[PDB]
Structures are given as structure tokens and as C-alpha cells.
Amino acid sequence: MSGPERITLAMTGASGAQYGLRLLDCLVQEEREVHFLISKAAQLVMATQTDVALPAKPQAMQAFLTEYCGAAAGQIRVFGQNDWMAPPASGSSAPNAMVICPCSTGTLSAVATGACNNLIERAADVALKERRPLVLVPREAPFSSIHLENMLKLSNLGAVILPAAPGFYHQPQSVEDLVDFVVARILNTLGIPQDMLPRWGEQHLVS
Amino acid sequence: MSGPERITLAMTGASGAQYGLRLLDCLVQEEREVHFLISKAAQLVMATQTDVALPAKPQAMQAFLTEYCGAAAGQIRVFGQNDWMAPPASGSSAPNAMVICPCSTGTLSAVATGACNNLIERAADVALKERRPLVLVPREAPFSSIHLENMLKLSNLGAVILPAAPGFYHQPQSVEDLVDFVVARILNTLGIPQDMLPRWGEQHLVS
Amino acid sequence: MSGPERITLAMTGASGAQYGLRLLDCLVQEEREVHFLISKAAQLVMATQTDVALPAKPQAMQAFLTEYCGAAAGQIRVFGQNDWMAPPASGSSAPNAMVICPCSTGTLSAVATGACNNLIERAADVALKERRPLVLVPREAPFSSIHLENMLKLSNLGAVILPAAPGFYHQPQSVEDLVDFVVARILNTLGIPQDMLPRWGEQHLVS
Amino acid sequence: MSGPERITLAMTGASGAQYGLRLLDCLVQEEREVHFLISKAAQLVMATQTDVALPAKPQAMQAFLTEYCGAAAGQIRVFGQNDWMAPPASGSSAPNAMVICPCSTGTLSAVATGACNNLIERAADVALKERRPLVLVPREAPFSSIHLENMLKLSNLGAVILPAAPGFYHQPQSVEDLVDFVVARILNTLGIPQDMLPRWGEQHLVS
Amino acid sequence: MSGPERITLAMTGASGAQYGLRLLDCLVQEEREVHFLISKAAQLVMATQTDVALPAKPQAMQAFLTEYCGAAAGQIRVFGQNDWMAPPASGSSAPNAMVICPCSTGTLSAVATGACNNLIERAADVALKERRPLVLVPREAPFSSIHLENMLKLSNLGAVILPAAPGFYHQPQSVEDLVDFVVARILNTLGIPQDMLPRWGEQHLVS
Amino acid sequence: MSGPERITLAMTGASGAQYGLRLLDCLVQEEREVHFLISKAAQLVMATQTDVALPAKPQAMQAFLTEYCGAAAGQIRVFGQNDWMAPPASGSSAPNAMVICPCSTGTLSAVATGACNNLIERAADVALKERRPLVLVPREAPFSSIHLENMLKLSNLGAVILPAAPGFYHQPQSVEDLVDFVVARILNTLGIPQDMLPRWGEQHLVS
Amino acid sequence: MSGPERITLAMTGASGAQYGLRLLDCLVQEEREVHFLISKAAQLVMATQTDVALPAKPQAMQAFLTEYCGAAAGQIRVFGQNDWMAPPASGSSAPNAMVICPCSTGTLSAVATGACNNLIERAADVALKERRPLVLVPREAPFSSIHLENMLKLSNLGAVILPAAPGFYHQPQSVEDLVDFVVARILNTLGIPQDMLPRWGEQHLVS
Amino acid sequence: MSGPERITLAMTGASGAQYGLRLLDCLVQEEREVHFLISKAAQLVMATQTDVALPAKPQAMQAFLTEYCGAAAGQIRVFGQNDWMAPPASGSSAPNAMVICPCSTGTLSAVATGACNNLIERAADVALKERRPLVLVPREAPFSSIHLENMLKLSNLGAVILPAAPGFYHQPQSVEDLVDFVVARILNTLGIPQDMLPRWGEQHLVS
Numbered sequence A, B, C, D, E, F, G, H: 001m002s003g004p005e006r007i008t009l010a011m012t013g014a015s016g017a018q019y020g021l022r023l024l025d026c027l028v029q030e031e032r033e034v035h036f037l038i039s040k041a042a043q044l045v046m047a048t049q050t051d052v053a054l055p056a057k058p059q060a061m062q063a064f065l066t067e068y069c070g071a072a073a074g075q076i077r078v079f080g081q082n083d084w085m086a087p088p089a090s091g092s093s094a095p096n097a098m099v100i101c102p103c104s105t106g107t108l109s110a111v112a113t114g115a116c117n118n119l120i121e122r123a124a125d126v127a128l129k130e131r132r133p134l135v136l137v138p139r140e141a142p143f144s145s146i147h148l149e150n151m152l153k154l155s156n157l158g159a160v161i162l163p164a165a166p167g168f169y170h171q172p173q174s175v176e177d178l179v180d181f182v183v184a185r186i187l188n189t190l191g192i193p194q195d196m197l198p199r200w201g202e203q204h205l206v207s
């Protein structure tokens, strides 16, 4: 298999829950193991901008998502915001790639400064110190200079800053087609196969 | 009228022509005067990702857009890429706000470095030296550290970096609803009235 | 196979065309796919400092190089300087390593600043944002502080700055032996097998 | 095999010889090839803080270590401090990962500044220019701002700064258990299998 | 008495509780007054990596520690994480030295950025603004560039960054001997007498 | 006694040996303990610019200086350039103030970069990490930007940069009076009594 | 003649008037034209630390110095502190080298910041903008970080920072011999012949 | 004569001895005086990559080179690595231009940091403080960020960084023709006549 076997997928309180749910579903279909984390604000976003009725507690959540995605048993692990017992809290864990999708400006800040106040922030701190993949998917506009400095710092240290900025070059016809563009970019970044967005120019031999 | 009477709208070669066409139409409906500039790459984008058959030469272009938007005669001015005779080339011109929507990574670079190689780049250089509004709407993912440094420099100097990153908090049902979210943000930035995106929380009196 | 299956090889207007032609030939012999780009200045260099009569237009060029190197059909793709349809223009393309050999001081500048004015510059911009290999082979002396700052910025972001500075530790007897030293270094950087430069010290067991 | 086939292991004059000897032994047991370098100060440390009677000259040293670790013939190569003939002195060598364990503050300084005064420093300079793994294991307290600036510079360039700071979360009962924690972290960094430190949380499915 | 009469000892959630308990005991034996603060994460660390059954609430904690260490009544004060009434919250308090042992990467971050979210962070903020001693004892490996930048900033402002990196030059035979090395370094930094680690070279008169 | 009981006095290869010999004599007369270190270049300076015939080996040197200054037995300790057994090599030593008088540009460099190549450089590295007094007395003209950057870095970290730049405000009549001005400044910096340079203005009550 | 025909010699209020008077005399003997400027504080220094009774007003001063040095009529020009009519105030003047000897910390500050409050400061501002020689001779100890930053800035812009730090390698026997060392260094910097300090090593052919 | 009368030519341990020998020969033919310095590593390079059997000791070396180049007696001075008696060690020496050809990455480092550990490094330190020409000829590939930062610092201070990167625009037919290109560039930098590389375009009057 190309790409990581295990992804830590953290969802934080930016207005783009569709992208994290779609990514979760694609990752499950590519038979990856997902360690799923979600912030309190992200739970309010999902409740108010989607049709998904996500249970509050980690075990009910894990059961719900396993159904929602058609996952295998234990394929999706759910950990709460102070569960330091969970793999992502330590660099001695097995290697996984981490994606924060969507990534709020507050979570971006915490990761840039090293705040480690909850499991998502500590997980990203560990990805950085271990040189493990870390992809942040901000959804904000305008970006202020505070946001941009935090993104630059992290980019300079090897994180991938992948804004939720879909392109129109595959002729999108629906909101779902724009959500899939962003998701396809994330999977490409992670090195995981995808067939939602063709490889640009692959059939063009000469100019 | 709130907001600027005249906007310089430059469209450059990022995959988001829908946003610049929609903005052009909203600006016309709010009876603003638009000085419209478009790059060669942006013409290829529009030809390949939209249904809009935009003529190549500035006078045919001006006639086409005036029809497309329902504008009044002389409401939309079109200037070519080396027309130094046009108002945006000089700080002695009448004040206008400038928006680059969409803004390619190459145009972002040129504006950050001061390259002034064509009328769009010189127009942005003049907006900066005159302290006139300058809004850039990048559409790229990932953003590299080169992109992020160029955005930060410009943000620090007072430009507004407004990525084409729509939110989902107004329940979008179509691609058009996502395009209008971004457009609504731009008009808000410019101080121009809009009724596509409600004022968040305006009716909430207490927590 | 070790190393990348596909290399984007861009030749720009520094006085070292021999190195890019030799690299092209080595890449073909290692059965890699080459996406070949060449600047207008690089065409003048090749015309004046080599015996290679390279045709001007991309399809005639592709036929010429395919012969010159003994390549298989479609092994070498040639794209012109504004062919945005070509794979290297987008990060959604299939992954390839990019080498700019030789790299003029102007191309170094454009890549460091993000100028994206033609397909070579945009290709390098995409390599950077995608975290794909990017090797620059400058040929200039002295290096000014402008050159050195541009190289440092790019090195800091993970590009490899590999100056056309051959060593003499394999006893070179000809101009070709110096050209092959530099080429051997490039292939090593890319992780592609080569037998022009032995592995230093591989038989030395103790001091 | 996961991880590098060949490791350059340099031991320098910080008070932690136990960690470099233990790492050497683990690397031998995982059937890796080790290019072993040791500074004059590190020889005084080993003589005074361990029970290991290490011979002075490279060939006697190689014989001693080969016995001490149970290595195969030629599995451990020993090179002296000015043996420029040895593989680590040149980037044209075969790829290996380099670890400096322990890393004195003086060696940290030399690597950060590019001093290349002996084979260890030149070896690290080459690892950096080749983008090959470089792990530094400092043992000092307090760390001054000079130390911290030197570490930051190197971290920013992709070196791994792994201080000899063992954790207590695997219930250590002996000095050997603390030495093995640090060694286990190094092997994890290098991507080499180890069974001294379990994978944190690997059996935890839900919070 | 040499050294401070009063120490604020904060324990945060890094895997090194042994060092803070040992320091607490040494400080009590040198008849100092200790203002003891402990984070929620540090309570989970102590519960899981030590044999010490520390009560949760500040008054039960104070009674427990007073027994554990043989302290005099009122020698150890315990304050909770939001007790702004406590001396360390204000610069108008009586002078004391502050040690954060162990110091998590999150607490390091908060102190470097000025976050003041709880009493430990505010206490360190006050130590800095008052020019009072502040010693941080991180326990992490690798250190990332985020950690290293946060340490450098604080070192530059006069904090002492004293990693939990014991040396082996006093022939340690047990885990306790390594814990005491680090503790001895802290007491030396604070100017408090200790007889666990001899004064290096004190009897050496000539080379 | 005011000021430190023990001073590490290092003499390095700048053209000002008179100042270090005079300081050594003043320190002995104020009954301080001096740990004396001298570089190979400083030995050549003393041989060629003074009348002092200093023996080469540390024990003969210690006997010579003890006579030259009228010191008590064991008041002056002499350590060689690789004597890591000596107190100044470790921060676990008893506290002393360190003066490098004169300080060559090479020694200034090594201290600024953390090179630790010999006992003087390591001693200064330890003074810095321990927050112990460190006074550097450069003697060079012009100062280049390399020198000035190295001095600034060290000044910013709390070292005292005290150039061998005597003043004329005490009416000097001899070379000895200029040497004593500089020495008086050093003793003032260290907080040690001196009566060579009066306290400026001490008898002036009103303007 | 080697070196400049005209020198602007400014004397400011550091305790080293001997050096500026000696330089003035050497410049006169080498038949240079001197534009002489002196600050109010420098007049108090000269009155209190030398035997030279310098008149207050520019014309009496010019007559006095012309006698003191044996100069030709009009060889020494004296200008007051607000005489903007004088050549050094404008870059349109004839080229001259400028030396500030001695240079107070206040004058160093003004030159580094561009303060131009009097003719000396404006003269130095003009030397810098014209790329004309500018030599500053500070006399201060310790140098603080403010002093060192001001010196570095100016050194980086091409000024020569030449501290009043005499060497002892020409066997000085008097205060005058130390004053002449510094003066000899200044003349060397300016490219003016001098025979007070031999050319180091000029007769040494082999090592 | 145009250009300097005296050149300090230092050869250090990069793989390009041919360039320093050829430069030495050209300098002798232009009747310049050469102060020749060579490092221990450079002696190993010359022994292994050239046919030149250079004696070890300075006087035998001077005799050998005087023969090899056809020099006049005393035209080439040879100084050893610790011969502080030699002119280049002091700024009070007669002015000469300094070239380090080839310049190892270690020597580049030492010059950038001010290390002054041997006569070559001190000579370069003096060139910088005296504002005398300093040309460095590195031979390394890739250049890391450490190398590039060291080059930039020195370039910014006025050193010339002239990499051993020959061009092909004079139709080179041999290894000697590439060596002469680099040498011709160095002589041009120094302002010394050369007829190996024509003046580009000198006969071109119009475009």
C-alpha cells in the first residue's frame, strides 16, 4: 500500500465539517486505520452545519462513525480531548500521518506556539518532533498577519498548509464536487490513492 | 453610498474565474464604476472552466461584459496589460479600491516584490504606495512557504489577503452559494452593501 | 527501481548546456520518463556553445532529442514555455522530481520569489508546494549576495542547491569527465543509479 | 529491512558513553553496518566513567568492539579523526544515517557552524549537504542560549536534536533501563526496529 | 543561609515526577519554604509512574506532602490552579525563586508566550517581570524547533533551561543516583547547598 | 570580602600580556584564589613583548607565578589546555568569575559560537551556562563586523565586553598607569576593591 | 601622494584627546589639508586632561592649532558646530576622508541613527551617503550592547570602527608610544604614509 | 601595474588544487609577490589528485615552487600554519589581496565565524578588518544552508565568493581550459591582467 497505514484525523471548530467527514470516509475506503479526534467547537459546527448527528461520548461516537462509513471493527478509534493514554500523545507510539481538517485559527495558533492544551494540540506537537506528516486545512477569510505568521512558521518546519480552497479545473457541478477536490488534494499530500481528481496533463505528450 | 465609487478589478490565472465574474456582476448592481483588467492566463482559465466566451481585445471585451452584467454605458472600463495611459497606472489618478480576484501565486509574488511588469502589477504597486484598498484573493493549495511569506509581507503592509475559502455556515446548496459566500466577504471588506450573507448573530441579544 | 520514475528537466540560460544534455542522456539510459523544458535563452546558449542543433518548436525538439538519446517513443515529453496544459503546471499532476540544469541566476531568482512567469518557474513553484524534489544547478561566478540569499532561502525550504562545481578526486582527463562528475552528483541526489563516480571509501575498512 | 543499512556512529566527549555503547550493540544486533568514530575527549570519558577498556588505535579498537558486541567481520568499521579516505568524508559515499551519541556542546557548535575540523564534524557537514539523516544526542545541563541557538539552527535544517533525557513512563528499575529508553528513541528516529520501549497506546481502542 | 528562603515549585505533566518529588524533599531538608503547585496532567503522571498516592485537593495534598517529607507545619504551602489569592500570582508578593520541575512542552510554550492560563503560568510570568529566578526542567525527546525556540526565548530573558539530562561522571549505580544528579544541578543553580554531587576538580591543584 | 573568592584568569594571544599579568598580581594581593590558564599563542606573546620568562609546563609555571606575585601556596592553580579534570571544565565546580585578559579575536569567536576546543573555551562555555561572571578583554583594531557581531552576541547574553581601551582622565604618566586603568576597570566589574582609579566625582556635592 | 588630500578631523568628548592632537600633527606633517571640528564636551576634555590651552572661538582656534602644529596658512580650517556653510555639511563638497578621534558613545549613537544635530554628526551622515571614508575611534570600557549594535551597524555600512586599543608588539616605553600606535593604525586605514609602526613581518621570507 | 603588488594565496583542502597551482603560476608571470600558505588537508589533496610532489616543510616548499613556476628569488614566500611572525598575521603589515583557492567548507566556516585557528584563518580575519581584498573559491556540491549562510555573511561584508564553477562560453577543449576560466575570473576580480578569457562583447557595437 502506498501512503500511511494509520492517520490521526482531528476535526476542529472551523466551518468546514464536510471536508473532515468526507476525508474520514475516503480513508476508511482505502482500508486505513483512523485515530479520530474532535474538539468541542467542532461538535457544535457539525451539529449546526451538517445533517450528521454525532454522539457526544467517545464510545458512542466510534460506533456511529463505524456505521456512517462502513468501517471494519476497530478501524476507527475515537479518543477524547484529555486521553493521554491514546497513541497520538507520545512520540513512542507507532508512526502515523496527522491531518487537522478543518483546522481552526485557534488550533493553528496552538500548534505554531506548542501549547499542547488538549490531545489534538499535543498530537500535532508530537508529529512535529517526530518528523511525521502533519497537514493543516485552515478555513478562514481574510487571513490576518497572525494567521499567516503561524502558517509560515509551520510550513517552514515541514507541515503542509492546505487551505480549504477548491479549484474549478475539474468542472465541478455540486458542493460535493468542491468538497471532493479538497479531499483529493489531502490524499495526494499523504500519498494515498484517489480517483476523484485526475492527474493533470497525464495524457498530454507535447506542446 | 458606503464604500468606494470605483473598483479596479483584476482577474489573474488562478482556477477561480467564477468568483471574479460574480464580483463584477455584484459591483455593477451596486452602481459602481469598475476598471477591469485581465491577464493572458486568466483568459485561458475563463475559456476552459467557464461557459463565458470572452472576447480577446479590450473594446470587444468591454462591450461583452457590459451586456453580460447589465451595466450602464461607461460603467465598466477595460484596459489592456500595457496600457499605461489608464488610471490605475498612476497614483495621480482618482482613488479607487483594487481587488485581484482570483490572484495567482505569480501575481501575488509580483505584488509582494514590486515587479510592476504589466498593468495589474503596477496598479497594485500604486494602491500600496497610495494607501488605497488592495484585496488579494488567492486560490492555491497547498500554500508553500514562498506563498505564505509573500502574503504575510503584503498583509503587514495593509493589503487584505482573502483566500477563496468559502464557509458552510449559511447552509450552501449549490456551487453558486459557495461562490457567493466568497464574494460577500469581499464586498464586506470593501464596505459595499451585500445581502447574500446575513450579519452573523445580529438578532442574538443574550447568551 | 530506486529513485523517481519521472523527472522534469528544465534547461535555462546559464553557460553549461553540456550538463543538462548529459543528464538527459543518463536519465534516458536509466529508463526514466523525462518532461523536458527549455528557455529561450537556454536555446541561444546551446546554439553557441555546443554542437547540438536543437530544433525550435516542441514537437521537432521531441523528435530530435528522442534520436539524440536513443530514447523510447514517448519517453521524453517536450513542453513549451506557456503550455499550462502540461503536467508540471499543477500539483494535481503525477509526482516527479524536478531538476533545473543549468539554472540561470534569473531562474534562481524567480523560483526564490515565486514569480511563476513561464512553465519552468511555475513547475518549480509546484515542486515546492508539493514537497517534491527540486534540484537547482547554478553556473555563475562570483556569486553575489543576491544570488546567495536566493539560494539560501530555497535550501532552507528543502531545495537542493548543487552548483556546477566539479571535483578532481576521480582523476579527470577530459571536459567530459568533469561534466560527468556533476551529472553523477545530480543522480546521486535524486537517488538514481550511476557508475560514473565510485562510492568514496567503500572499500576502506580501517584507518 | 526497515531503516538504514549503514549508520555512522560518532561518539564525542559528553558524559554519556553508556548511550553510544548501548546503541552500537543494538545496531549490531539488528545486523546493520556501523562506521564508528570517536573523539579524543570521548576516549577520556569512556576510560573514566565506564568499565570498557577501549584500545587507542583504530585497528585495535575495531577488533575490541567486534568482540564486545558480537559483530560479524567487517560489520563495524573504525576510522580515525583525520582519515579523509573514509566514506563519511564525502557526499559521493554510499548513503548512511549519522548519529552523534553523545554529542558534546563543542561538537554541536562545530556542526552548527560548519567547522569540519575532524572526521566527525566533516561527516555531519556531509550528512547535512546530502539531506541524509543526522541525529544529535546532547548531554548538558543547563543548556545556555549558545547551545540552544546551535540546536535550533540544526533542527531547522532537518537534524534531529534528541537530548539524553530519559522518560519514566515504562517504569524503569535500573540505570540500564534509562539508557535503553534513550537508545529506543534513537532507533525509532532512525526507523530501526526495537523492543525495549513498547508503542504507546497501541492497545487502547477508545477513551 | 545561601540561596532563596522561599521556592515556588511547580510540577507539570512531563514524565519525570521523581525529580520534582526529590527536589521537594531536598528543599524541605534545607529548611526552605516551598509554595507547591501541580497541574492536572502532572497528577496523572505521578499516579501512573510513581508509588506516591497524592491526594487531589490542596489541603489534603499539603498534609500528605508535609508527612512525606518530614516538613515543619506551614513549611509547604499548596495552592490550586486558579487560586489567584496565592503569593505567586502577583509581583507584589515576597520574592521567591521558581522552579518548574518537570516542565512539560505545553508549560514551556505558555511561559514563552505569556499565556498565564493558570497559576503556574502566571507565577512564571511574574518571575520574569520581577527578574526573579526561574528554572525550567524540560523532559522531552526529540526536542522540536518549536520547543527549542521557546527555550531560547526564555534563556535569552534570563530563565535557566535545565533539561532532565543526567550525567554519568559521579558513577551512578541506581535510578536514584541519576535523579539526584539532576536535583543537585537545580540546587546549584538556585545557590542552595547540596552534597549529592561533589564540586568538580576542587582538589586538583595542577595539570 | 566583596567580590568573588575565586577567579579563572585566562590569557590568550592578543598583544596585551601586561594587562593579564598586572591583573594576576592585583588578584593575588586581594587574597583571591586564581585558576590560571594560558594559550600557546599567549605564551609566544609574553615571550616576545614582555620581560617575563614564563616556563612552559603547568607545574613550573605555577611555581614561577607564585614567586612573581608573592602568592601563598596553592593560591594560584595552573591548568593546561586539555586538562578536563580541572574545575573550570564543569558547571558542577565551585562558582568562580572568569576573565579572559587579553582575549584574542579567535577566542572571542570560539566563545561566541560555543566551540569548546580547549579548556579556556570550555571554561567560558560553562560560565555562560551557569550564569557566572564572564569578562572578555579584547585588544584589536580595527574591529571588523565579525568581531563586533561576536561581541554583541556575548554582551546580549550577559558577558562583559571590556576592551583594552584606557582612558586619560586620571593623568597617566607612564605605560604602567595605562595598564592599571584597564585593570582597575576589570576589578570594578568583578566587584573587587581597587585603589588605582579613584571613584569619579565622589567628592562633588553640587553642580 | 597616497591617501586623501583632505581629512575632516572631528574631536568629540571621549577621554582620549591625545590621540586627536597627535593625529592632527601627523596629518599636517604629511601636508594634508585638515577640516577641524570639535565638540563642546571635547573642549572640556582637552582642558582637563591635557596641557593644551585651546581657544574657544573658531578663528582663535585655527590660529592656535596652526602654530601648535607648524602648519601652513589655510592648511587647517576650523568650523564651528552649526556652521552649515562649511564643506562637510554637503555631499556636493570636494571629497575628503573623515575621522572622529576620539569618538564618544554619544557621537557614535548619532552617526548610527542619522541624528545630524551638529556639524560633526551631519558631516558623518554625508560621508556615509557619499561612500567617503569614515573612521570612528571610540574610547569606552565596557562597551555595552547599545554601543556594540551602533558599531556593528556602521561597520556593516563600511565605516571603520578603530577602537583606541593600542598593542604592545612594538615595545612601547612611554604613553606617547601607545598614542602613536593608535595614530599609526588610523593613518594606515586612511592610506597615508607613516613611520611610527613598522610593517609587520616585511623582512620575514620563510617560516 | 594594475592590481595588487602582493597576493596572499592560501590553499585549503577542497578538491581543486589545480586552480591554486595555476593561479600561483599566473601571479608569478605577472611579476607579483605571493605569500603562499597551504593547509595540511590541502597537502593531502595535492598529493592525491595531482602530479605535483610538494615538499612538506616551508623552506623546501619555497624552493620547489620557485622552480615550478619560474619565479624570481624571494618572489614566493612560504609561511607555515602557526607562523605568527609572517606579514598576513597582522593588520600592520603591508597591504596585500588575499585569495583562498580552493577554499574548503571548513575554512569558509572559520572565516565567517572569525575562528583564527591557524595562519590562513587569521590572515582572512585581518583582510576583513583592514578592508583588504578577500576572494574565496569554494569547491563543494551540493552547498548546504550552512555553507550558503557562511558565504552570504562574507559576501555582505565585502568578500568575493567565487565558486569553482567554470563556464563554457569560450569553447573549452580540455580540463586545462576549464581551470584557466576560473583562474581568469579570479585575476579579473583582483584587477590583474589576463589573456586567457577575452572581454565579452568588446567588439560588438550594436544590437
Ligand SMILES: Cc1cc2c(cc1C)N(C[C@H](O)[C@H](O)[C@H](O)COP(=O)(O)O)c1[nH]c(=O)[nH]c(=O)c1N2
Residues within 6 Å of the ligand: A011, A012, A013, A014, A015, A016, A039, A040, A041, A042, A044, A045, A048, A103, A104, A105, A106, A107, A139, A140, B167, B169
Ligand atoms: C458555527 C461556528 C463556526 C465557526 C467557528 C465557531 C462556530 C461555533 N469558528 C471558531 C472557533 O470554533 C473558535 O475560535 C474555537 O475556539 C476553536 O476551538 P478549537 O480549535 O476547535 O478547539 C471558526 N473558526 C475559524 O477559524 N474558521 C471558521 O470557519 C469558524 N467557523
Ligand SMILES: Cc1cc2c(cc1C)N(C[C@H](O)[C@H](O)[C@H](O)COP(=O)(O)O)c1[nH]c(=O)[nH]c(=O)c1N2
Residues within 6 Å of the ligand: A167, A169, B011, B012, B013, B014, B015, B016, B039, B040, B041, B042, B044, B045, B048, B103, B104, B105, B106, B107, B139, B140, C084, C085, C116, C117, C118, C122
Ligand atoms: C487552467 C489553469 C489553471 C490554473 C493555472 C493556469 C491554468 C492555465 N495557474 C497558473 C498560472 O495561471 C500561471 O502560473 C501564470 O503564469 C499566472 O500568470 P498571471 O498571474 O495570470 O499573469 C494557477 N495558478 C494558481 O496560483 N492557482 C490556480 O488555481 C491555477 N490554476
Ligand SMILES: Cc1cc2c(cc1C)N(C[C@H](O)[C@H](O)[C@H](O)COP(=O)(O)O)c1[nH]c(=O)[nH]c(=O)c1N2
Residues within 6 Å of the ligand: C011, C012, C013, C014, C015, C016, C039, C040, C041, C042, C044, C045, C048, C103, C104, C105, C106, C107, C139, C140, H167, H169
Ligand atoms: C551565451 C550566454 C551565456 C550566458 C547567459 C546568456 C547567454 C546568452 N546568461 C544569461 C541569462 O541567459 C539571462 O540573464 C537570461 O535572462 C536567463 O533567462 P532564463 O532563466 O534562461 O529564462 C548566463 N546567466 C547565468 O546565470 N550564468 C551564465 O553562465 C550565463 N551564461
Ligand SMILES: Cc1cc2c(cc1C)N(C[C@H](O)[C@H](O)[C@H](O)COP(=O)(O)O)c1[nH]c(=O)[nH]c(=O)c1N2
Residues within 6 Å of the ligand: D011, D012, D013, D014, D015, D016, D039, D040, D041, D042, D044, D045, D048, D103, D104, D105, D106, D107, D139, D140, E167, E169, F084, F085, F116, F117, F118, F122
Ligand atoms: C570527564 C569529562 C566529562 C565531560 C566532558 C569532558 C570530560 C573530560 N565534557 C567536555 C568536552 O569533552 C570538551 O568540551 C571537549 O572539547 C569536547 O570535544 P569533542 O566534541 O569530544 O571533540 C563534557 N561536555 C559536554 O558537552 N557535556 C558533558 O557531559 C561533558 N562531560
Ligand SMILES: Cc1cc2c(cc1C)N(C[C@H](O)[C@H](O)[C@H](O)COP(=O)(O)O)c1[nH]c(=O)[nH]c(=O)c1N2
Residues within 6 Å of the ligand: A084, A085, A116, A117, A118, A122, D167, D169, E011, E012, E013, E014, E015, E016, E039, E040, E041, E042, E044, E045, E048, E103, E104, E105, E106, E107, E139, E140
Ligand atoms: C503519562 C503522561 C506522560 C507524559 C505526558 C502526559 C501523560 C499523561 N506528557 C503530556 C502533557 O502532560 C500534556 O501535553 C499536557 O497538556 C501538559 O499540561 P501541563 O503543562 O501539565 O498543564 C508529556 N509531555 C512532555 O512534555 N514530556 C513528557 O515526558 C510527557 N509525558
Ligand SMILES: Cc1cc2c(cc1C)N(C[C@H](O)[C@H](O)[C@H](O)COP(=O)(O)O)c1[nH]c(=O)[nH]c(=O)c1N2
Residues within 6 Å of the ligand: F011, F012, F013, F014, F015, F016, F039, F040, F041, F042, F044, F045, F048, F103, F104, F105, F106, F107, F139, F140, G167, G169, H084, H085, H116, H117, H118, H122
Ligand atoms: C606576537 C603576536 C601578537 C598578536 C597575535 C599573535 C602573535 C603571535 N594575535 C593572534 C592570535 O594570537 C592568533 O589569531 C591565535 O590563533 C589566537 O589563539 P588563542 O586565542 O590565543 O588560542 C593577535 N590577535 C588579536 O586578536 N589581537 C592581537 O593584538 C594579536 N597580537
Ligand SMILES: Cc1cc2c(cc1C)N(C[C@H](O)[C@H](O)[C@H](O)COP(=O)(O)O)c1[nH]c(=O)[nH]c(=O)c1N2
Residues within 6 Å of the ligand: F167, F169, G011, G012, G013, G014, G015, G016, G039, G040, G041, G042, G044, G045, G048, G103, G104, G105, G106, G107, G139, G140
Ligand atoms: C572629562 C570627561 C571625560 C569623558 C566624558 C565627558 C567628560 C567631561 N565622556 C562623556 C561625553 O563627553 C558625553 O556623553 C557627551 O555628551 C559627548 O558629547 P559629544 O559626542 O562630544 O558632543 C566620555 N564619553 C565616552 O564615550 N568615553 C569617555 O572616555 C568619556 N570621557
Ligand SMILES: Cc1cc2c(cc1C)N(C[C@H](O)[C@H](O)[C@H](O)COP(=O)(O)O)c1[nH]c(=O)[nH]c(=O)c1N2
Residues within 6 Å of the ligand: C167, C169, D084, D085, D116, D117, D118, D122, H011, H012, H013, H014, H015, H016, H039, H040, H041, H042, H044, H045, H048, H103, H104, H105, H106, H107, H139, H140
Ligand atoms: C582528498 C580530499 C578531498 C576533499 C577533502 C579532503 C580530502 C582529503 N575535503 C575535506 C576537507 O579537506 C576537510 O573538511 C578539512 O578539515 C579541511 O581543512 P582545511 O580547511 O584545509 O584546513 C573537501 N572539502 C571540501 O569542502 N570540498 C572538497 O572538494 C573536498 N575534497
Ligand SMILES: CC(C)=CCOP(=O)(O)O
Residues within 6 Å of the ligand: A084, A085, A089, A090, A091, A092, A126, D167, D169, D200, E015, E139, E140, E141
Ligand atoms: C503520553 C506520553 C507517554 C508522553 C511522552 O511521550 P514522548 O516521550 O514525549 O514522546
Ligand SMILES: CC(C)=CCOP(=O)(O)O
Residues within 6 Å of the ligand: B084, B085, B089, B090, B091, B092, B126
Ligand atoms: C503612468 C504614470 C503617469 C505613472 C506615474 O505615476 P506616479 O507619479 O508614480 O504615481
Ligand SMILES: CC(C)=CCOP(=O)(O)O
Residues within 6 Å of the ligand: A167, A169, A200, B015, B139, B140, B141, C084, C085, C089, C090, C091, C092, C126
Ligand atoms: C494548470 C493548473 C490546473 C494549476 C492548478 O494546480 P494546483 O491546484 O494549484 O496545484
Ligand SMILES: CC(C)=CCOP(=O)(O)O
Residues within 6 Å of the ligand: C167, C169, C200, D084, D085, D089, D090, D091, D092, D126, H015, H139, H140, H141
Ligand atoms: C574526502 C572527499 C573526496 C571530499 C569531497 O566530497 P564532496 O564532493 O564534497 O561530497
Ligand SMILES: CC(C)=CCOP(=O)(O)O
Residues within 6 Å of the ligand: E084, E085, E089, E090, E091, E092, E126
Ligand atoms: C493577583 C494579583 C494581585 C495580580 C497583580 O500583580 P501585579 O501588580 O501584576 O504584579
Ligand SMILES: CC(C)=CCOP(=O)(O)O
Residues within 6 Å of the ligand: D015, D139, D140, D141, E167, E169, E200, F084, F085, F089, F090, F091, F092, F126
Ligand atoms: C569535565 C566535566 C565533568 C563536564 C561536565 O560538566 P557539566 O555537567 O556539563 O556542567
Ligand SMILES: CC(C)=CCOP(=O)(O)O
Residues within 6 Å of the ligand: G084, G085, G089, G090, G091, G092, G126
Ligand atoms: C549644507 C547643504 C548645502 C546640504 C545639502 O547637501 P546634499 O545635497 O544633501 O549633499
Ligand SMILES: CC(C)=CCOP(=O)(O)O
Residues within 6 Å of the ligand: F015, F139, F140, F141, G167, G169, G200, H084, H085, H089, H090, H091, H092, H126
Ligand atoms: C601577529 C600580530 C602582531 C597581530 C596584531 O595585529 P593587529 O594589531 O591585530 O592588526
